[PDB]
Design an enzyme around this catalytic site. Structure first.
Site, short mmCIF file in Angstrom:
data_model
loop_
_atom_site.label_atom_id
_atom_site.label_comp_id
_atom_site.label_asym_id
_atom_site.label_seq_id
_atom_site.Cartn_x
_atom_site.Cartn_y
_atom_site.Cartn_z
N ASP A 1 31.85 18.80 16.45
CA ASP A 1 30.98 17.91 15.66
C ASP A 1 31.81 17.00 14.77
O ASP A 1 31.50 15.81 14.59
CB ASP A 1 29.90 18.67 14.87
CG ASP A 1 30.45 19.80 13.99
OD1 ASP A 1 31.63 20.22 14.12
OD2 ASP A 1 29.65 20.29 13.16
N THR B 1 22.76 26.67 13.87
CA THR B 1 21.34 27.02 13.72
C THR B 1 20.46 26.20 14.67
O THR B 1 19.54 26.73 15.28
CB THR B 1 20.87 26.88 12.27
OG1 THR B 1 21.04 25.54 11.85
CG2 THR B 1 21.71 27.75 11.36
C1 LIG Z 1 32.65 23.60 10.18
C2 LIG Z 1 31.59 23.75 11.28
C3 LIG Z 1 31.09 25.20 11.26
C4 LIG Z 1 30.35 22.84 11.07
O1 LIG Z 1 29.34 23.28 12.02
P1 LIG Z 1 27.72 23.07 11.97
O2 LIG Z 1 27.42 22.79 10.50
O3 LIG Z 1 27.57 21.87 12.90
O4 LIG Z 1 26.95 24.24 12.63
C5 LIG Z 1 32.23 23.39 12.62
O5 LIG Z 1 32.76 22.07 12.58
C6 LIG Z 1 33.32 24.32 13.10
O6 LIG Z 1 32.99 25.48 13.64
N1 LIG Z 1 34.55 23.98 12.96
C7 LIG Z 1 35.71 24.74 13.42
C8 LIG Z 1 36.72 24.81 12.27
C9 LIG Z 1 37.34 23.49 11.90
O7 LIG Z 1 36.75 22.41 12.10
O8 LIG Z 1 38.47 23.55 11.34
#
Ligand SMILES: CC(C)(COP(=O)(O)O)[C@@H](O)C(=O)NCCC(=O)O
Ligand SMILES: CC(C)(COP(=O)(O)O)[C@@H](O)C(=O)NCCC(=O)O
Ligand SMILES: [Mg+2]
Ligand SMILES: [Mg+2]
Lengths: 248, 248
Positions: free
Chosen positions: B108, B13
């Site tokens: 992240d 977002t």
């Molecule tokens: C879980 C998340 C969507 C968090 O993203 P955000 O809240 O920063 O927009 C992101 O870390 C992500 O797309 N992860 C990929 C899947 C994983 O970490 O297993």
């Protein structure tokens, strides 16, 4: 001497249609709710399911949480059965509605509370896992309010549509303490997490109101039946409430 | 000297843009991520915000969970700074990655883990409340996996869009054991519920791995920081990780 009644629970995703000749045993079917469906389309879907039972229906009772669908149900009842349905609503009598706006309580929740008070007791906590998951509290025959959570599918769907990278994951409990891939992470957060959410809400309720029985119901409840502490598992709770409200 | 670095955290977002000259104090701004944006558009947004600092940036580091945005960041870096950005990803080195497919872990989350191991030690549990809410486990300097839950706004929006009758509710904790109107019901289920969900997941992790320190971070964390037990609250954790990964 044992007239047949049709009970309808119109949900956001699915509608449940059930017939009973005694209000004790129920035959059930489920259909998609479907946006622009008509009375003839509903009849067409139900015809091969109800079969002969169709022409035995003497009354129709409905709990609906989708206002746009209500005219379809009304038209169906009038056209095919020459009757108007009886609509579940919060009203005074067997239940006292101790909330700010009883008229805003979803009809499914009202039905659940009515069924509970009629069949189980004056005190309890109802967990209904459907499109949303609801918690409803009944104390000494008074509805006290509750909680609304997104349902399991709503949750995994929200993560899918609301992020670039996350896939749509199957709703299945995690049998692990930390997820080792994305799908496992989501199952743990959504399924086990929602269970913990419910147990925390229930726990805090029981601190204030004592050790009330917990009843579990809803289309998505069977998957986590063995993960939430409950005294009663009753998949027919809403339909029973529709029956009791409309036909006593 | 103390060269200035730009750190970017591209979320689903919002995107965070931060500058630092020492990797300890950060000046930060936030913008919408925005689907169709260009390098010139980003520069236009950042110009009045960074002001003179724009002239001073010597390196750009980025964690992104929105792949479509990555070409915009690349072009912005090349056109306005004549450099390529450095991309946060899981790789072997200061963190071991004890999961099935480390390359799929969100950047992240990678940044959070890197920041944690650099500043806070080898063992911990990281809660990041953003678009999604993540739990990340770090044991003896190894990433062990975690959980992913819908974020607070994602939940209330999903209830609004996914049902006929529910309104879009403001995210605020419930100050009561059961909700007495619809809004209160949803706050209890979503906000307090998600807190309970996190505490259950973390509780079970602690049973297996011991009572590791919990760090709380994320754009939606402030509203519940007095409700979730934590040893550290660090709003800059992700950006710190981008800095450490890219620039040591
Ligand atoms: C879980 C998340 C969507 C968090 O993203 P955000 O809240 O920063 O927009 C992101 O870390 C992500 O797309 N992860 C990929 C899947 C994983 O970490 O297993
Ligand atoms: C919370 C509900 C969406 C649950 O509906 P369902 O899962 O049956 O589709 C429904 O009970 C409802 O629209 N309630 C109105 C708000 C209230 O009960 O406070
Ligand atoms: Mg059809
Ligand atoms: Mg603009």
């Amino acid at each position: 001497m044992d007239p047949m009644y049709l009970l309808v629970d119109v949900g956001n995703t699915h509608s449940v249609f059930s017939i009973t000749e005694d209000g004790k045993t129920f035959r059930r079917w489920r259909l998609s709710t479907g946006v622009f469906q008509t009375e003839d389309e509903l009849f067409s879907h139900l015809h091969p399911l109800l079969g002969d039972a169709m022409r035995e229906i003497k009354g129709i009772g409905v709990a609906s949480v989708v206002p746009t669908q209500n005219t379809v149900i009304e038209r169906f009842s009038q056209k095919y059965f020459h009757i108007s349905p009886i609509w579940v609503k919060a009203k005074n009598g067997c239940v006292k509605w101790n909330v700010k706006n009883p008229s805003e309580v979803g009809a499914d929740r009202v039905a659940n509370v009515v069924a509970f008070v009629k069949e189980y007791g004056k005190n309890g906590i109802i967990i209904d896992m459907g499109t949303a998951t609801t918690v409803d509290l009944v104390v000494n025959g008074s509805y006290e309010g509750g909680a609304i959570l997104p349902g399991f599918f709503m949750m995994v769907h929200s993560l899918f549509r609301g992020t670039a990278k996350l896939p749509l994951v199957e709703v299945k409990p995690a049998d692990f303490v930390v997820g080792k891939d994305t799908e496992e992470n989501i199952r743990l957060g959504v399924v086990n997490g929602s269970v913990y959410a419910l147990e925390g809400i229930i726990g805090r309720i029981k601190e204030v109101y004592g050790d009330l029985p917990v009843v579990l119901t809803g289309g998505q409840s069977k998957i986590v039946k063995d993960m939430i502490k409950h005294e009663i598992f009753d998949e027919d709770l809403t339909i029973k409430g529709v029956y009791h409200f409309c036909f006593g």
